[PDB]
Amino acid sequence: YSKIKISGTIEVVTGLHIGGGGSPVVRDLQTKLPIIPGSSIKGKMRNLLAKHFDERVLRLFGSSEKGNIQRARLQISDAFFSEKTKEHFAQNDIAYTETKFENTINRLTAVANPRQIERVTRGSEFDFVFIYNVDEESQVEDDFENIEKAIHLLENDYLGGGGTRGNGRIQFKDTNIETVVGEYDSTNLKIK
Amino acid sequence: MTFAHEVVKSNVKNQVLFNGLTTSKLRNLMEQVNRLYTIAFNSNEDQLNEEFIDELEYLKIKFYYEAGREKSVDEFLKKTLMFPIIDRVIKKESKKFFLDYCKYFEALVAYAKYYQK
Protein backbone atom coordinates (compact mmCIF):
# COMPACT_ATOMS: atom_id res chain seq x y z
CA TYR A 1 0.00 0.00 0.00
CA SER A 2 1.59 3.18 -1.27
CA LYS A 3 1.14 6.95 -1.36
CA ILE A 4 2.08 9.16 -4.32
CA LYS A 5 3.02 12.82 -3.81
CA ILE A 6 2.33 15.49 -6.43
CA SER A 7 3.82 18.91 -5.78
CA GLY A 8 4.17 21.89 -8.07
CA THR A 9 3.42 25.55 -8.66
CA ILE A 10 0.34 27.37 -9.92
CA GLU A 11 0.61 30.78 -11.53
CA VAL A 12 -2.05 33.46 -11.51
CA VAL A 13 -2.33 34.52 -15.14
CA THR A 14 -5.24 36.78 -14.31
CA GLY A 15 -5.47 37.78 -10.66
CA LEU A 16 -7.00 35.34 -8.19
CA HIS A 17 -9.65 36.11 -5.60
CA ILE A 18 -10.79 33.73 -2.89
CA GLY A 19 -11.82 36.08 -0.11
CA GLY A 20 -12.76 33.94 2.87
CA GLY A 21 -13.28 37.08 4.92
CA GLY A 22 -15.89 38.40 2.50
CA SER A 23 -14.14 42.52 0.13
CA PRO A 24 -11.11 40.78 1.56
CA VAL A 25 -8.94 37.87 0.50
CA VAL A 26 -7.95 34.82 2.50
CA ARG A 27 -4.88 35.51 4.57
CA ASP A 28 -3.12 34.32 7.69
CA LEU A 29 -4.16 36.49 10.60
CA GLN A 30 -0.43 36.78 11.37
CA THR A 31 1.64 36.49 8.20
CA LYS A 32 -0.89 38.55 6.25
CA LEU A 33 0.19 36.81 3.13
CA PRO A 34 -2.31 35.48 0.60
CA ILE A 35 -3.06 31.78 0.58
CA ILE A 36 -5.37 29.63 -1.48
CA PRO A 37 -7.33 27.34 0.83
CA GLY A 38 -7.05 23.90 -0.60
CA SER A 39 -10.67 23.06 -0.06
CA SER A 40 -11.41 25.69 -2.67
CA ILE A 41 -9.19 23.82 -5.08
CA LYS A 42 -10.98 20.63 -4.17
CA GLY A 43 -14.40 22.11 -4.68
CA LYS A 44 -13.58 23.55 -8.06
CA MET A 45 -11.97 20.33 -9.15
CA ARG A 46 -14.96 18.30 -8.08
CA ASN A 47 -17.51 20.54 -9.71
CA LEU A 48 -15.59 20.43 -12.95
CA LEU A 49 -14.89 16.73 -13.06
CA ALA A 50 -18.38 15.79 -12.03
CA LYS A 51 -19.69 18.09 -14.71
CA HIS A 52 -17.54 16.16 -17.12
CA PHE A 53 -20.02 13.34 -16.67
CA ASP A 54 -20.05 9.29 -11.25
CA GLU A 55 -18.45 6.39 -9.41
CA ARG A 56 -15.14 7.97 -10.37
CA VAL A 57 -15.85 11.18 -8.48
CA LEU A 58 -16.79 9.16 -5.41
CA ARG A 59 -13.56 7.23 -5.74
CA LEU A 60 -11.52 10.41 -6.04
CA PHE A 61 -12.86 12.65 -3.33
CA GLY A 62 -15.25 10.52 -1.25
CA SER A 63 -18.84 11.23 -0.09
CA SER A 64 -20.06 8.19 1.96
CA GLU A 65 -23.60 9.71 2.08
CA LYS A 66 -25.45 6.87 0.24
CA GLY A 67 -24.40 4.14 2.74
CA ASN A 68 -21.39 3.13 0.58
CA ILE A 69 -18.11 3.73 2.52
CA GLN A 70 -15.02 4.26 0.27
CA ARG A 71 -13.04 7.06 2.02
CA ALA A 72 -11.32 9.83 0.13
CA ARG A 73 -8.44 8.76 -2.08
CA LEU A 74 -7.14 12.31 -2.68
CA GLN A 75 -5.86 14.86 -0.18
CA ILE A 76 -5.38 18.44 -1.39
CA SER A 77 -3.83 21.00 0.90
CA ASP A 78 -3.82 24.74 0.64
CA ALA A 79 -0.88 26.44 -1.02
CA PHE A 80 1.32 29.38 -0.26
CA PHE A 81 3.56 31.92 -1.89
CA SER A 82 6.87 30.38 -2.69
CA GLU A 83 9.96 32.08 -1.40
CA LYS A 84 10.58 32.91 -5.04
CA THR A 85 7.61 35.19 -5.46
CA LYS A 86 8.20 36.84 -2.09
CA GLU A 87 11.84 37.63 -2.80
CA HIS A 88 11.11 38.90 -6.30
CA PHE A 89 8.34 41.20 -5.08
CA ALA A 90 10.32 42.55 -2.16
CA GLN A 91 13.25 43.26 -4.47
CA ASN A 92 11.09 44.85 -7.11
CA ASP A 93 8.93 46.57 -4.47
CA ILE A 94 5.60 45.26 -5.72
CA ALA A 95 2.56 45.03 -3.52
CA TYR A 96 1.17 41.54 -3.14
CA THR A 97 -2.47 42.38 -3.62
CA GLU A 98 -4.28 44.64 -6.04
CA THR A 99 -7.43 46.62 -5.38
CA LYS A 100 -9.56 46.78 -8.51
CA PHE A 101 -12.18 49.45 -8.91
CA GLU A 102 -15.41 48.26 -10.48
CA ASN A 103 -18.67 49.94 -11.38
CA THR A 104 -22.25 49.01 -12.08
CA ILE A 105 -24.85 50.85 -14.12
CA ASN A 106 -28.51 50.96 -13.35
CA ARG A 107 -30.71 50.82 -16.40
CA LEU A 108 -33.49 53.39 -16.67
CA THR A 109 -31.27 55.38 -14.34
CA ALA A 110 -27.75 55.27 -15.82
CA VAL A 111 -26.31 56.05 -12.36
CA ALA A 112 -22.83 54.90 -11.17
CA ASN A 113 -22.36 52.49 -8.20
CA PRO A 114 -18.63 52.02 -7.26
CA ARG A 115 -17.33 48.51 -6.29
CA GLN A 116 -13.98 47.24 -4.85
CA ILE A 117 -12.51 43.69 -5.33
CA GLU A 118 -9.19 42.52 -3.76
CA ARG A 119 -7.30 40.35 -6.28
CA VAL A 120 -4.05 38.48 -5.90
CA THR A 121 -1.29 39.94 -8.02
CA ARG A 122 -0.59 38.71 -11.53
CA GLY A 123 2.34 36.33 -11.88
CA SER A 124 2.64 35.14 -8.29
CA GLU A 125 3.31 31.43 -7.79
CA PHE A 126 1.74 29.04 -5.30
CA ASP A 127 3.36 25.80 -4.16
CA PHE A 128 0.70 23.13 -3.95
CA VAL A 129 0.84 19.56 -2.72
CA PHE A 130 -1.53 16.72 -3.56
CA ILE A 131 -1.42 13.29 -1.98
CA TYR A 132 -2.88 10.25 -3.70
CA ASN A 133 -3.07 7.10 -1.57
CA VAL A 134 -3.25 4.31 -4.12
CA ASP A 135 -5.59 1.87 -2.42
CA GLU A 136 -5.90 -0.24 -5.59
CA GLU A 137 -2.81 -1.00 -7.65
CA SER A 138 -4.91 -2.00 -10.64
CA GLN A 139 -6.72 1.32 -10.87
CA VAL A 140 -4.18 4.03 -10.20
CA GLU A 141 -3.45 4.66 -13.88
CA ASP A 142 -7.14 5.20 -14.50
CA ASP A 143 -7.37 7.54 -11.56
CA PHE A 144 -4.48 9.63 -12.68
CA GLU A 145 -5.95 9.95 -16.14
CA ASN A 146 -9.05 11.32 -14.47
CA ILE A 147 -7.05 13.61 -12.26
CA GLU A 148 -5.25 14.70 -15.41
CA LYS A 149 -8.50 15.67 -17.09
CA ALA A 150 -9.52 17.54 -13.98
CA ILE A 151 -6.29 19.49 -13.92
CA HIS A 152 -6.63 20.11 -17.64
CA LEU A 153 -10.09 21.57 -17.32
CA LEU A 154 -8.97 23.89 -14.58
CA GLU A 155 -6.19 25.07 -16.86
CA ASN A 156 -8.76 26.81 -19.04
CA ASP A 157 -11.13 27.81 -16.25
CA TYR A 158 -11.11 29.92 -13.11
CA LEU A 159 -11.20 29.65 -9.33
CA GLY A 160 -13.18 31.81 -6.99
CA GLY A 161 -15.40 34.76 -7.69
CA GLY A 162 -16.15 36.72 -10.81
CA GLY A 163 -14.52 34.06 -12.94
CA THR A 164 -16.97 34.83 -15.69
CA ARG A 165 -16.13 38.49 -15.14
CA GLY A 166 -12.44 38.11 -15.79
CA ASN A 167 -10.34 36.78 -12.94
CA GLY A 168 -8.97 33.52 -11.67
CA ARG A 169 -7.23 31.91 -14.63
CA ILE A 170 -4.29 29.86 -13.37
CA GLN A 171 -1.49 27.75 -14.81
CA PHE A 172 0.38 24.67 -13.63
CA LYS A 173 4.17 24.45 -13.83
CA ASP A 174 7.00 22.29 -12.57
CA THR A 175 4.89 19.35 -11.53
CA ASN A 176 6.95 16.48 -10.20
CA ILE A 177 5.49 13.24 -8.91
CA GLU A 178 7.27 11.19 -6.28
CA THR A 179 6.43 8.05 -4.33
CA VAL A 180 6.78 8.66 -0.60
CA VAL A 181 5.00 5.74 1.07
CA GLY A 182 5.29 2.16 0.01
CA GLU A 183 7.38 0.75 -2.81
CA TYR A 184 5.29 1.71 -5.81
CA ASP A 185 6.96 3.19 -8.86
CA SER A 186 5.99 6.64 -10.06
CA THR A 187 8.32 7.24 -13.00
CA ASN A 188 5.58 6.89 -15.58
CA LEU A 189 2.74 8.93 -14.09
CA LYS A 190 2.42 12.26 -15.84
CA ILE A 191 0.55 15.48 -15.08
CA LYS A 192 0.96 18.81 -16.85
CA MET B 1 20.52 62.48 0.41
CA THR B 2 17.09 62.65 2.05
CA PHE B 3 17.92 66.15 3.29
CA ALA B 4 17.41 67.16 -0.34
CA HIS B 5 14.02 65.42 -0.11
CA GLU B 6 12.80 67.35 2.93
CA VAL B 7 14.49 70.53 1.80
CA VAL B 8 11.37 71.12 -0.27
CA LYS B 9 9.65 72.17 2.96
CA SER B 10 12.80 74.20 3.60
CA ASN B 11 12.11 76.10 0.36
CA VAL B 12 8.63 77.39 1.24
CA LYS B 13 8.96 81.15 0.91
CA ASN B 14 6.77 84.24 0.70
CA GLN B 15 3.98 83.25 -1.17
CA VAL B 16 5.90 81.24 -3.77
CA LEU B 17 7.61 77.85 -3.67
CA PHE B 18 11.01 77.33 -5.27
CA ASN B 19 10.53 80.85 -6.60
CA GLY B 20 7.16 80.04 -8.12
CA LEU B 21 7.75 76.49 -9.34
CA THR B 22 4.52 74.86 -10.59
CA THR B 23 3.85 71.19 -11.61
CA SER B 24 2.67 72.53 -15.04
CA LYS B 25 6.36 72.99 -16.09
CA LEU B 26 7.59 69.74 -14.40
CA ARG B 27 4.94 67.30 -15.82
CA ASN B 28 7.28 66.51 -18.78
CA LEU B 29 10.04 65.34 -16.36
CA MET B 30 7.58 63.04 -14.50
CA GLU B 31 6.37 61.46 -17.80
CA GLN B 32 9.96 60.89 -19.09
CA VAL B 33 11.11 59.33 -15.75
CA ASN B 34 7.96 57.09 -15.66
CA ARG B 35 8.57 55.97 -19.30
CA LEU B 36 12.13 54.81 -18.38
CA TYR B 37 10.82 53.26 -15.09
CA THR B 38 8.48 50.92 -17.08
CA ILE B 39 11.45 49.93 -19.34
CA ALA B 40 13.50 49.18 -16.16
CA PHE B 41 10.51 47.11 -14.87
CA ASN B 42 10.61 45.08 -18.14
CA SER B 43 14.42 44.64 -17.66
CA ASN B 44 15.08 41.49 -15.55
CA GLU B 45 18.83 41.62 -14.81
CA ASP B 46 20.81 44.31 -13.02
CA GLN B 47 23.21 45.33 -15.78
CA LEU B 48 21.51 47.99 -17.86
CA ASN B 49 21.36 47.80 -21.64
CA GLU B 50 23.39 50.37 -23.52
CA GLU B 51 20.30 51.73 -25.27
CA PHE B 52 18.82 52.20 -21.83
CA ILE B 53 21.96 54.10 -20.88
CA ASP B 54 21.56 56.38 -23.88
CA GLU B 55 18.00 56.84 -22.71
CA LEU B 56 19.48 58.10 -19.47
CA GLU B 57 21.64 60.44 -21.52
CA TYR B 58 18.57 61.80 -23.26
CA LEU B 59 16.91 62.14 -19.87
CA LYS B 60 19.70 64.34 -18.56
CA ILE B 61 19.58 66.31 -21.79
CA LYS B 62 15.91 66.94 -21.15
CA PHE B 63 16.81 67.95 -17.62
CA TYR B 64 19.23 70.56 -18.88
CA TYR B 65 16.76 71.83 -21.45
CA GLU B 66 13.96 72.16 -18.93
CA ALA B 67 16.31 73.96 -16.57
CA GLY B 68 17.15 76.31 -19.43
CA ARG B 69 13.54 77.05 -20.32
CA GLU B 70 12.38 77.87 -16.79
CA LYS B 71 14.23 79.46 -13.91
CA SER B 72 12.35 78.06 -10.92
CA VAL B 73 12.80 74.56 -12.35
CA ASP B 74 16.48 75.36 -12.84
CA GLU B 75 16.71 76.29 -9.17
CA PHE B 76 14.94 73.07 -8.25
CA LEU B 77 17.28 70.91 -10.29
CA LYS B 78 20.46 72.55 -9.05
CA LYS B 79 19.43 72.97 -5.42
CA THR B 80 18.31 69.34 -5.22
CA LEU B 81 21.53 67.98 -6.77
CA MET B 82 19.66 66.52 -9.73
CA PHE B 83 22.54 66.43 -12.23
CA PRO B 84 25.09 64.79 -9.92
CA ILE B 85 22.64 62.07 -8.98
CA ILE B 86 21.75 61.56 -12.64
CA ASP B 87 25.41 61.19 -13.58
CA ARG B 88 25.94 58.86 -10.64
CA VAL B 89 23.06 56.66 -11.80
CA ILE B 90 24.55 56.63 -15.29
CA LYS B 91 27.88 55.66 -13.77
CA LYS B 92 26.46 52.83 -11.69
CA GLU B 93 24.44 51.32 -14.57
CA SER B 94 22.52 49.32 -11.96
CA LYS B 95 18.78 48.91 -12.09
CA LYS B 96 18.28 48.99 -8.34
CA PHE B 97 19.94 52.35 -7.88
CA PHE B 98 17.79 53.62 -10.74
CA LEU B 99 14.63 52.59 -8.93
CA ASP B 100 16.00 54.35 -5.88
CA TYR B 101 16.42 57.49 -7.94
CA CYS B 102 12.90 57.26 -9.30
CA LYS B 103 11.50 56.97 -5.79
CA TYR B 104 13.53 60.01 -4.79
CA PHE B 105 12.20 61.99 -7.72
CA GLU B 106 8.69 60.86 -6.87
CA ALA B 107 9.05 62.08 -3.31
CA LEU B 108 10.35 65.41 -4.56
CA VAL B 109 7.50 65.77 -7.04
CA ALA B 110 4.75 64.75 -4.68
CA TYR B 111 5.98 66.97 -1.81
CA ALA B 112 6.15 69.80 -4.35
CA LYS B 113 2.56 69.23 -5.39
CA TYR B 114 1.48 69.33 -1.75
CA TYR B 115 2.45 73.01 -1.65
CA GLN B 116 1.01 74.99 -4.54
CA LYS B 117 -0.77 78.37 -4.49
Partner: protein, 296 residues
Protein backbone atom coordinates in the same frame (compact mmCIF):
# COMPACT_ATOMS: atom_id res chain seq x y z
CA UNK C 1 10.98 5.52 25.31
CA UNK C 2 11.61 8.28 22.77
CA UNK C 3 9.43 11.33 22.30
CA UNK C 4 8.23 12.66 18.96
CA UNK C 5 7.91 16.34 18.05
CA UNK C 6 5.58 17.55 15.31
CA UNK C 7 5.56 20.41 12.80
CA UNK C 8 2.60 21.19 10.56
CA UNK C 9 3.22 24.28 8.38
CA UNK C 10 -0.51 24.23 7.60
CA UNK C 11 -3.20 24.95 10.19
CA UNK C 12 -5.08 21.99 11.59
CA UNK C 13 -8.54 21.87 13.13
CA UNK C 14 -8.94 19.74 16.25
CA UNK C 15 -12.34 20.44 17.73
CA UNK C 16 -14.30 19.25 20.72
CA UNK C 17 -17.98 19.41 19.90
CA UNK C 18 -18.72 21.27 16.67
CA UNK C 19 -16.80 21.82 13.46
CA UNK C 20 -16.48 25.50 14.19
CA UNK C 21 -14.88 24.70 17.54
CA UNK C 22 -11.09 24.76 17.61
CA UNK C 23 -8.35 23.36 19.83
CA UNK C 24 -4.57 23.41 20.21
CA UNK C 25 -3.98 19.99 21.78
CA UNK C 26 -5.46 16.53 21.36
CA UNK C 27 -5.71 13.64 23.78
CA UNK C 28 -4.19 10.21 23.54
CA UNK C 29 -7.51 8.85 22.34
CA UNK C 30 -7.42 10.55 18.98
CA UNK C 31 -3.77 9.80 18.46
CA UNK C 32 -4.22 6.14 19.22
CA UNK C 33 -7.18 5.99 16.89
CA UNK C 34 -5.35 7.65 14.04
CA UNK C 35 -2.20 5.60 14.42
CA UNK C 36 -4.28 2.43 14.57
CA UNK C 37 -6.29 3.23 11.41
CA UNK C 38 -3.04 4.18 9.67
CA UNK C 39 -1.69 0.76 10.54
CA UNK C 40 -4.89 -0.79 9.13
CA UNK C 41 -4.36 1.22 5.93
CA UNK C 42 -0.87 -0.20 5.87
CA UNK C 43 -2.55 -3.44 6.87
CA UNK C 44 0.14 -4.62 9.26
CA UNK C 45 -0.43 -6.66 12.40
CA UNK C 46 -2.26 -4.75 15.11
CA UNK C 47 -1.81 -7.04 18.11
CA UNK C 48 1.80 -5.95 18.50
CA UNK C 49 0.68 -2.35 18.25
CA UNK C 50 -2.46 -3.08 20.27
CA UNK C 51 -1.40 -4.07 23.79
CA UNK C 52 2.23 -2.95 24.06
CA UNK C 53 2.40 0.76 23.21
CA UNK C 54 2.12 3.51 25.81
CA UNK C 55 1.42 7.04 24.58
CA UNK C 56 0.96 10.40 26.27
CA UNK C 57 -1.46 13.13 25.37
CA UNK C 58 -0.26 15.73 22.93
CA UNK C 59 1.42 18.76 24.28
CA UNK C 60 2.21 22.11 22.71
CA UNK C 61 5.72 23.43 22.38
CA UNK C 62 7.47 26.61 21.34
CA UNK C 63 10.78 27.52 19.71
CA UNK C 64 12.87 25.82 22.38
CA UNK C 65 10.54 25.20 25.33
CA UNK C 66 8.65 22.05 26.22
CA UNK C 67 5.69 22.07 28.55
CA UNK C 68 3.49 19.76 30.55
CA UNK C 69 -0.12 20.22 31.62
CA UNK C 70 -0.89 21.61 35.09
CA UNK C 71 -0.99 19.02 37.96
CA UNK C 72 -4.18 19.44 40.08
CA UNK C 73 -2.34 19.41 43.42
CA UNK C 74 -3.59 21.27 46.48
CA UNK C 75 -1.38 24.33 47.04
CA UNK C 76 -2.07 26.44 50.13
CA UNK C 77 -1.35 30.18 49.71
CA UNK C 78 -3.87 34.02 45.64
CA UNK C 79 -5.99 31.45 43.80
CA UNK C 80 -6.68 33.64 40.77
CA UNK C 81 -3.68 33.51 38.43
CA UNK C 82 -3.15 29.80 39.02
CA UNK C 83 -6.65 29.12 37.76
CA UNK C 84 -6.02 30.83 34.43
CA UNK C 85 -2.83 28.86 33.76
CA UNK C 86 -2.82 25.56 31.91
CA UNK C 87 0.73 24.63 30.99
CA UNK C 88 4.11 24.75 32.72
CA UNK C 89 7.62 24.72 31.20
CA UNK C 90 10.02 22.03 32.30
CA UNK C 91 12.42 24.63 33.68
CA UNK C 92 10.29 25.30 36.74
CA UNK C 93 8.07 22.19 36.62
CA UNK C 94 9.48 20.71 39.88
CA UNK C 95 9.74 24.29 41.28
CA UNK C 96 5.91 24.70 40.97
CA UNK C 97 5.36 21.28 42.67
CA UNK C 98 7.61 22.48 45.56
CA UNK C 99 5.89 25.93 45.54
CA UNK C 100 8.84 28.03 44.24
CA UNK C 101 6.62 29.43 41.43
CA UNK C 102 5.61 32.96 42.42
CA UNK C 103 2.40 34.68 41.46
CA UNK C 104 4.41 37.15 39.41
CA UNK C 105 6.34 34.18 38.05
CA UNK C 106 3.05 32.69 36.91
CA UNK C 107 2.18 36.03 35.37
CA UNK C 108 5.43 35.97 33.42
CA UNK C 109 5.03 32.40 32.22
CA UNK C 110 1.45 33.01 31.11
CA UNK C 111 2.71 36.06 29.28
CA UNK C 112 5.18 33.94 27.32
CA UNK C 113 2.47 31.47 26.40
CA UNK C 114 1.99 32.86 22.89
CA UNK C 115 2.38 29.59 21.03
CA UNK C 116 -0.25 29.99 18.32
CA UNK C 117 -3.59 31.58 17.56
CA UNK C 118 -7.15 30.59 16.71
CA UNK C 119 -9.25 31.50 13.69
CA UNK C 120 -12.56 30.76 11.99
CA UNK C 121 -12.57 29.87 8.31
CA UNK C 122 -15.78 30.31 6.38
CA UNK C 123 -16.71 27.82 3.73
CA UNK C 124 -19.59 27.70 1.26
CA UNK C 125 -21.22 24.66 -0.26
CA UNK C 126 -22.85 24.67 -3.67
CA UNK C 127 -23.48 20.94 -3.96
CA UNK C 128 -27.12 21.72 -3.09
CA UNK C 129 -29.94 22.87 -5.44
CA UNK C 130 -28.32 26.37 -5.57
CA UNK C 131 -26.52 25.25 -8.79
CA UNK C 132 -29.17 22.65 -9.83
CA UNK C 133 -32.25 24.97 -9.64
CA UNK C 134 -33.71 27.81 -7.48
CA UNK C 135 -32.07 27.56 -4.00
CA UNK C 136 -29.46 29.24 -1.73
CA UNK C 137 -25.84 28.34 -0.92
CA UNK C 138 -24.91 26.81 2.42
CA UNK C 139 -22.30 28.72 4.39
CA UNK C 140 -20.77 26.96 7.38
CA UNK C 141 -17.80 27.55 9.66
CA UNK C 142 -14.68 25.76 10.78
CA UNK C 143 -12.21 26.61 13.52
CA UNK C 144 -8.50 26.27 12.82
CA UNK C 145 -5.30 26.94 14.69
CA UNK C 146 -2.03 28.28 13.25
CA UNK C 147 1.09 27.30 15.27
CA UNK C 148 4.13 29.65 15.13
CA UNK C 149 6.90 28.62 12.63
CA UNK C 150 8.80 26.88 15.51
CA UNK C 151 5.64 25.66 17.35
CA UNK C 152 3.70 22.34 17.18
CA UNK C 153 2.88 19.25 19.25
CA UNK C 154 4.69 16.33 20.85
CA UNK C 155 3.92 13.08 22.67
CA UNK C 156 5.88 10.82 25.04
CA UNK C 157 5.86 7.12 24.25
CA UNK C 158 7.30 4.00 25.80
CA UNK C 159 7.44 0.33 24.96
CA UNK C 160 9.73 -2.31 23.58
CA UNK C 161 12.33 -1.48 20.99
CA UNK C 162 10.45 -3.43 18.34
CA UNK C 163 7.33 -1.54 19.32
CA UNK C 164 9.26 1.70 18.92
CA UNK C 165 10.49 0.75 15.46
CA UNK C 166 7.00 -0.15 14.31
CA UNK C 167 5.72 3.13 15.70
CA UNK C 168 8.50 4.88 13.82
CA UNK C 169 7.41 3.34 10.54
CA UNK C 170 3.73 4.04 11.12
CA UNK C 171 4.49 7.60 12.14
CA UNK C 172 6.42 8.15 8.93
CA UNK C 173 3.57 6.77 6.88
CA UNK C 174 1.04 8.95 8.66
CA UNK C 175 3.29 12.05 8.27
CA UNK C 176 1.64 12.65 4.92
CA UNK C 177 -1.95 11.93 5.85
CA UNK C 178 -3.66 14.28 8.24
CA UNK C 179 -4.70 14.59 11.89
CA UNK C 180 -7.17 16.77 13.82
CA UNK C 181 -10.31 17.26 11.79
CA UNK C 182 -10.93 18.22 8.18
CA UNK C 183 -7.82 16.37 7.06
CA UNK C 184 -8.80 16.07 3.42
CA UNK C 185 -9.87 19.69 3.29
CA UNK C 186 -6.31 20.97 3.40
CA UNK C 187 -5.49 20.90 7.10
CA UNK C 188 -3.09 18.97 9.25
CA UNK C 189 -0.04 17.61 7.49
CA UNK C 190 3.17 17.24 9.41
CA UNK C 191 6.87 16.51 9.37
CA UNK C 192 8.22 15.17 12.63
CA UNK C 193 11.48 15.01 14.51
CA UNK C 194 12.61 12.69 17.28
CA UNK C 195 14.52 14.75 19.84
CA UNK C 196 15.86 13.64 23.21
CA UNK C 197 15.73 16.41 25.79
CA UNK C 198 18.01 15.50 28.65
CA UNK C 199 15.95 17.48 31.12
CA UNK C 200 12.65 15.95 30.06
CA UNK C 201 14.27 12.53 30.13
CA UNK C 202 15.20 13.19 33.73
CA UNK C 203 11.66 14.34 34.38
CA UNK C 204 10.33 11.00 33.22
CA UNK C 205 12.99 9.27 35.31
CA UNK C 206 12.14 10.56 38.76
CA UNK C 207 10.62 8.58 41.61
CA UNK C 208 8.14 9.80 44.18
CA UNK C 209 4.97 9.22 46.17
CA UNK C 210 2.68 11.17 43.88
CA UNK C 211 2.24 10.53 40.16
CA UNK C 212 0.83 12.76 37.44
CA UNK C 213 -1.40 11.10 34.88
CA UNK C 214 -0.22 12.41 31.55
CA UNK C 215 -2.73 10.57 29.34
CA UNK C 216 -6.46 9.89 29.08
CA UNK C 217 -7.07 6.75 31.11
CA UNK C 218 -9.65 5.02 33.28
CA UNK C 219 -9.00 1.94 35.39
CA UNK C 220 -10.74 -1.38 34.84
CA UNK C 221 -13.81 -2.42 36.79
CA UNK C 222 -11.89 -4.26 39.50
CA UNK C 223 -9.27 -1.59 40.20
CA UNK C 224 -11.35 1.54 40.57
CA UNK C 225 -12.11 1.11 44.26
CA UNK C 226 -8.44 0.93 45.21
CA UNK C 227 -7.47 3.56 42.66
CA UNK C 228 -9.77 6.32 43.87
CA UNK C 229 -8.44 6.32 47.42
CA UNK C 230 -6.79 9.74 47.44
CA UNK C 231 -6.93 11.59 44.17
CA UNK C 232 -7.60 14.96 42.60
CA UNK C 233 -9.12 14.53 39.19
CA UNK C 234 -11.42 15.71 36.42
CA UNK C 235 -13.74 13.60 34.28
CA UNK C 236 -13.81 14.47 30.59
CA UNK C 237 -16.64 13.18 28.43
CA UNK C 238 -15.33 11.71 25.20
CA UNK C 239 -17.81 11.25 22.36
CA UNK C 240 -17.39 10.92 18.60
CA UNK C 241 -18.12 9.01 15.40
CA UNK C 242 -16.36 6.22 13.46
CA UNK C 243 -15.05 5.55 9.95
CA UNK C 244 -16.06 2.72 7.56
CA UNK C 245 -17.81 0.50 10.12
CA UNK C 246 -21.50 0.17 9.30
CA UNK C 247 -23.87 1.41 6.63
CA UNK C 248 -24.91 4.76 8.04
CA UNK C 249 -22.29 7.08 9.50
CA UNK C 250 -24.94 9.23 11.17
CA UNK C 251 -26.17 5.95 12.65
CA UNK C 252 -22.66 5.09 13.89
CA UNK C 253 -21.18 6.89 16.88
CA UNK C 254 -19.22 5.44 19.78
CA UNK C 255 -21.08 5.75 23.06
CA UNK C 256 -20.15 8.66 25.26
CA UNK C 257 -17.32 7.52 27.50
CA UNK C 258 -15.62 9.07 30.46
CA UNK C 259 -12.00 9.20 31.51
CA UNK C 260 -9.85 11.18 33.88
CA UNK C 261 -8.30 14.36 32.55
CA UNK C 262 -4.58 14.99 32.17
CA UNK C 263 -3.74 16.91 35.32
CA UNK C 264 -5.08 14.56 37.91
CA UNK C 265 -2.90 13.33 40.75
CA UNK C 266 -3.19 9.80 42.07
CA UNK C 267 -1.87 7.93 45.08
CA UNK C 268 -2.39 4.38 43.87
CA UNK C 269 -1.16 3.78 40.35
CA UNK C 270 -3.41 1.76 38.10
CA UNK C 271 -2.80 0.28 34.73
CA UNK C 272 -5.47 1.28 32.25
CA UNK C 273 -6.99 -0.57 29.34
CA UNK C 274 -8.15 -0.12 25.77
CA UNK C 275 -11.92 -0.22 26.10
CA UNK C 276 -14.38 -1.45 23.53
CA UNK C 277 -17.03 1.17 22.93
CA UNK C 278 -18.45 -1.08 20.27
CA UNK C 279 -22.01 -2.12 19.59
CA UNK C 280 -23.94 -2.75 16.39
CA UNK C 281 -20.87 -2.55 14.18
CA UNK C 282 -19.02 -4.87 11.87
CA UNK C 283 -15.80 -4.59 13.87
CA UNK C 284 -14.77 -3.60 17.39
CA UNK C 285 -13.84 0.06 17.76
CA UNK C 286 -11.04 0.95 20.11
CA UNK C 287 -10.75 3.87 22.49
CA UNK C 288 -7.53 4.25 24.42
CA UNK C 289 -7.12 4.51 28.19
CA UNK C 290 -3.70 3.55 29.44
CA UNK C 291 -1.54 5.84 31.56
CA UNK C 292 1.99 7.14 31.33
CA UNK C 293 3.06 8.39 34.73
CA UNK C 294 5.58 11.04 35.67
CA UNK C 295 6.48 9.95 39.17
CA UNK C 296 6.82 13.01 41.34
Amino acid sequence: TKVFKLSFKTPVHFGKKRLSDGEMTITADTLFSALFIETLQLGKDTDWLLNDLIISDTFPYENELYYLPKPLIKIDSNHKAFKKLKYVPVHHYNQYLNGELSAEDATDLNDIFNIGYFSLQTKVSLIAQETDSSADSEPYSVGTFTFEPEAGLYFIAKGSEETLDHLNNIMTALQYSGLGGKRNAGYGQFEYEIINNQQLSKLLNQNGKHSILLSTAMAKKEEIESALKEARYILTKRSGFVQSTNYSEMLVKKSDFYSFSSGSVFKNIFNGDIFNVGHNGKHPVYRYAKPLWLEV
